[PDB]
């Protein structure tokens, strides 16, 4: 009977004792990254607009239309500041 897959099925018919011994002898910023950076910069503007929206909605004081108007105004302001900064940096 084998042990850990090693031995004979049986010693009978092998002409040997079947004794098994373990062998002691064996032992340029890729355009896609610039695209992600530009996306993150524009995202910061949209994040500011969304935060303003969150504040106005939580105050439950303004109608959804007035909140949309204030968000569009803030978006336009921040987008203009960003375009001016990009023009200045590229300059």
């Amino acid at each position: 009977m084998s042990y850990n897959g090693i031995g004979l099925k049986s010693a009978k018919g092998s002409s040997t004792s079947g004794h098994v011994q373990r062998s002691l002898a064996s032992n340029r910023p890729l355009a896609v990254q610039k695209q992600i950076e530009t996306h993150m910069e524009k995202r910061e503007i949209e994040v500011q607009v969304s935060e303003l929206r969150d504040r106005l909605e939580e105050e439950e004081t303004l109608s959804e239309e007035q909140i949309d108007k204030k968000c569009e105004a803030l978006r336009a302001k921040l987008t203009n500041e960003w375009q001016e900064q990009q023009r200045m940096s590229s300059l």
């Binding site: 896609v32 995202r43 500011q48 969304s50 935060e51 969150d54 909605e57």
Partner: protein
Amino acid sequence: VLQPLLPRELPKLLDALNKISKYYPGVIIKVEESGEHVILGNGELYMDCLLYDLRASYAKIEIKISDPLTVFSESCSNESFASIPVSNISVAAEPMDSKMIQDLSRNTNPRKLSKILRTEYGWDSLASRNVWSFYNGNVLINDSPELLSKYKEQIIQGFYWAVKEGP
């Protein structure tokens, strides 16, 4: 992983697996795309018991089985280096925060959810609003809204297909 010893007996195995799937609630049995059957169980004794039931009572056929394996999962350890689009719609990914992984693993309205995310997880204002779905420990974030909202359902479905069979 298992398969019948004799292919002629595959339908008997199918019937037996259905019985097992019903009698062993916690077992998950799924046929893989290669045609081999996968059995997921709680441990070595659980498997030994269900395999005895297959061989001795439900299937009564001989079944070849693999050595024990485990269910792996695919993840990312850093943010995506580039916004690469695909064609045949660019998507990015990041390592989810430990705290949210743990709470989702324990299963713990849009404005309420945005409060949860902003106060305990510190997500920004947009992320806390644009979450489209939570599935198997993963999150899809949408960040003109009308331009995208046309196919929200189909995008979510694609995400559901991706999260259950990674690259």
